Amino acid sequence: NRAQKLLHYLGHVMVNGPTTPIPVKASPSPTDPVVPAVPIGPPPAGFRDILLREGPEGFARAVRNHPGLLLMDTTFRDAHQSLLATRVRTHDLKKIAPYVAHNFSKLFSMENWGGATFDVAMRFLYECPWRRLQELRELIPNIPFQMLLRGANAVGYTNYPDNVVFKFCEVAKENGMDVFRVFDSLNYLPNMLLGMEAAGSAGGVVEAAISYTGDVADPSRTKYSLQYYMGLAEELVRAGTHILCIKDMAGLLKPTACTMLVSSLRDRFPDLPLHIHTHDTSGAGVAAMLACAQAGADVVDVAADSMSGMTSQPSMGALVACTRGTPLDTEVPMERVFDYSEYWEGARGLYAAFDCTATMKSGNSDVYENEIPGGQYTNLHFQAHSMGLGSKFKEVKKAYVEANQMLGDLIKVTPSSKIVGDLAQFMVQNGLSRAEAEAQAEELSFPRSVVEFLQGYIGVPHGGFPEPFRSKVLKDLPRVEGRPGASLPPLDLQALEKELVDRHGEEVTPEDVLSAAMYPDVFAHFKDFTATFGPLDSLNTRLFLQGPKIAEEFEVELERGKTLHIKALAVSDLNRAGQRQVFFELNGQLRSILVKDTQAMKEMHFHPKALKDVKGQIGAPMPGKVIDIKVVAGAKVAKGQPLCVLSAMKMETVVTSPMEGTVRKVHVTKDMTLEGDDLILEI
């Protein structure tokens, strides 16, 4: 009963379309991604060998004592979150993972988990994220792995109790995660210290990421000054971080600001490794990374050349070529870069339904005025499409700016940007301005994320909440102040394990109860879907998003040894219950799949009958047209008296009543062409 669920999925996708929401109506390309040649044998030695040999402090001293620029690949997580709405599957990553393991041994790390990959992998792709992590950990053994962990937000959207995040880092380090980049939205310091403690006690390398916004080189803006970042970095180094990081999530770091900030961090902490992360939204990413690498940055984040650009990271080939021959040489050969970007061009062609290039064709300097991050940009375009706002995204960006100013000049990264984007979609859908919605603040019903933020369930912003808005929206809802994670009670995780073993099965693991603690309803619907259709992980992307075509024999190997040569021969028409039939040739023998179509129902309405059991139910003895009614609705009549007269083709009849009674209502109007045995009078 394994190929039957797969054929049910394939027929359901053929007849009804894909169960994924599709924002751009397009098909996957017929061209396959070209995987290059990989030398057979064990891969080279990398930085994970020195990590497992001498710990995180020796890893930090090795990355600090490396002559030249080090790179981190973000193609597996942040490139397709910025460009393809986080929709790239584990199949296309596993096809290129041995090439990366053989040829990119000199990388610092590789971000391939965390962010929005958790929620999208369970929600839209029907995959387990721990399964992707384990598969790529077997495939790439020589390069350290890196995950993007929020403060007390783990991989969710709100603050969690401490035991859940500690257990989350414990199990993620158990599965294979090496480097943990911990950041917070509002730069709220105890949430950062909590996330750093949870990441450090699990045994992993800690990368304390400071969220950057504004401009430190512009003295006109004084809220997030250079001294603010210097004090934040001083306290984060005082908590025992191993690598400091600057997360510029919108792409706002300019070369002068880069030189100023990295030189301040280098002459304040002379032996601490600096990592810079930026997006190339404004079009100045490679220039900013060259400014950082000359100012004293150690690791910078890149992506493959076909998977970089618009809202993504800077390009790997441009960073390799722009440092060739310099003292900052990365000594990576450019031909391996060419083959890797060749693969990702072929693989990006498969995801044309979620692609950024259907709307945005080049960069945009207006990110200097709306400050939207890139992953949020593509996921926000999808979310605005799925709520009817799919043709008003410029107004969503304008209300984005308005909602940033209205909520008190927040630092927008994931959670806070999700709050500002929810408020922007609310202000677009209800036509409200800034002052127009602050005047009606005590009347309107803001969404759960905005009201939950104004309560303070994610933390406290810099300079405090907007207190007139917080007084007008929150009437008497509880304002839990201080730290949200030090107030909420710990979830009994063995109770949740006991709650989940009696619903799905007995292969429920701690990874599953962490998936259900982070997302209860998404894990429930994911488990129901994978009960119905089974492991759709090992399908290719054209098969997953499009199904097969007629008379084209395709090969599916679900598990080890179990191979299936499947043809799709015909699709019938609809049955009595609105169901179609699909005909397959599975392993050479004919099989049949019955799938419910989803559009051919809910089309019926007509006039009711005249029920014969009651003599006071006067109906039409013959069809035609009501030409005159002789009764007043409310009086009573005798039997034999005329009530209504009807006419048909050369025929006219007068309706008589069979007995007495009070005329309740005249059910028929004037000149209503009714059928036979249809009710004209209730009596």
Ligand X SMILES: *C(=O)CCCC[C@@H]1SC[C@@H]2NC(=O)N[C@@H]21
Give me the half-sphere count of Cα atoms (radius 13 Å) on the Cβ side of residue 370.
23
Position among 59, 113, 126, 426 found at the interface with a copy of itself (CB under 8 A): 426
3-state class (DSSP) for residue 302: strand
Distances (CA, A) of 520 to 113, 232, 386, 527: 20, 35, 22, 11
3-state class (DSSP) for residue 670: coil
First to last CA, the chain: 61
x-marked contacts with a copy of itself along 651-680 as a string, rule CB under 8 A: xxxxxx-x----------------xx----
Q: Is 98 in the site for a copy of itself (CB under 8 A)?
A: no
Instruction: Decide which of a copy of itself, ligand X, none touches 661; Cβ closer than 5 to 8 Å per partner kind.
Output: none
**Is the CB of residue 187 less than 8 Å from the CB of residue 210?**
yes
Q: Which ranges in 519-662 belong to alpha helices (H)?
A: 520-533, 541-546
Smallest gap from Cβ 150 to a copy of itself, in A, equals 16
Q: Which residues pair with 665 in a beta bridge?
A: 682
Nearer to ligand X, 43 or 115 (CB): 115
Q: Which residues contact 376 (CB under 8 A, 6 or more apart)?
A: 412, 414, 417, 418, 421
Q: Is 553 in the site for a copy of itself (CB under 8 A)?
A: no
Residues 114, 594: Cα–Cα separation, whole Å: 38
Residues 603, 620: Cα–Cα separation, whole Å: 25
Task: Return the residues of window 439-458 that contact a copy of itself according to CB under 8 A.
Answer: 443-449, 451
Q: Which residues pair with 274 in a beta bridge?
A: 244
Smallest gap from Cβ 276 to ligand X, in A, equals 20
Smallest gap from Cβ 129 to a copy of itself, in A, equals 17
x-marked contacts with a copy of itself along 161-200 as a string, rule CB under 8 A: ----------------------------------------
3-state class (DSSP) for residue 256: helix
Q: Which two tokens stand for residue 387?
A: 């709520």
Nearer to a copy of itself, 121 or 233 (CB): 121
Residues 471, 626: Cα–Cα separation, whole Å: 65
Q: Is 12 annotated as a binding residue?
A: no
224: left (phi over 0), alpha (psi -120 to 50) or beta: beta
Q: Is 315 in the site for a copy of itself (CB under 8 A)?
A: yes
Q: Which residues contact 42 (CB under 8 A, 6 or more apart)?
A: none
Residues across the chain: 683
Span of 104-112, 317-325, 395-403, 557-565 interacting with a copy of itself by CB under 8 A: 317-325
Instruction: Decide which of a copy of itself, ligand X, none touches 287; Cβ closer than 5 to 8 Å per partner kind.
Output: a copy of itself
Nearer to a copy of itself, 136 or 307 (CB): 307
Instruction: Decide which of a copy of itself, ligand X, none touches 656; Cβ closer than 5 to 8 Å per partner kind.
Output: a copy of itself
**Is the CB of residue 500 less than 8 Å from the CB of residue 521?**
no
Instruction: Decide which of a copy of itself, ligand X, none touches 540; Cβ closer than 5 to 8 Å per partner kind.
Output: none
Q: Is 216 in the site for a copy of itself (CB under 8 A)?
A: no
Q: Is 80 annotated as a binding residue?
A: yes
Q: Which helix (H) or strand (E) holds 636?
A: strand 636-637
Smallest gap from Cβ 116 to ligand X, in A, equals 4
Q: Is 255 in the site for a copy of itself (CB under 8 A)?
A: yes
Nearer to ligand X, 120 or 288 (CB): 120
Torsion of CA 409, 415, 420, 423, to 10 degrees: -140
Task: Return the residues of window 358-377 that contact a copy of itself according to CB under 8 A.
Answer: 361-366, 368-369
Residues 106, 50: Cα–Cα separation, whole Å: 12
Smallest gap from Cβ 64 to a copy of itself, in A, equals 25
Instruction: Decide which of ligand X, a copy of itself, none touches 187; Cβ closer than 5 to 8 Å per partner kind.
Output: none
Q: Is 213 annotated as a binding residue?
A: no
Smallest gap from Cβ 392 to a copy of itself, in A, equals 12
Residues 217, 573: Cα–Cα separation, whole Å: 67
Q: Which residues contact 271 (CB under 8 A, 6 or more apart)?
A: 64
Span of 330-338, 524-532, 535-543, 552-560 interacting with a copy of itself by CB under 8 A: 330-338
Smallest gap from Cβ 170 to a copy of itself, in A, equals 28
# residues near a copy of itself by CB under 8 A: 81
Q: Is 387 in the site for a copy of itself (CB under 8 A)?
A: yes
Binding site for ligand X (CB under 6 A): 86, 115-116, 119-120, 375-376, 379, 414, 417-418, 650
Q: Which two tokens stand for residue 91?
A: 């199949």
Q: Which residues contact 387 (CB under 8 A, 6 or more apart)?
A: 425, 429
Q: Is 78 annotated as a binding residue?
A: yes
Nearer to ligand X, 109 or 185 (CB): 185
Q: Is 414 annotated as a binding residue?
A: yes
Q: Is 277 annotated as a binding residue?
A: yes
Known binding residues for Mn(2+) are 78, 247, 277, 279
Known binding residues for substrate are 77-81, 150, 414
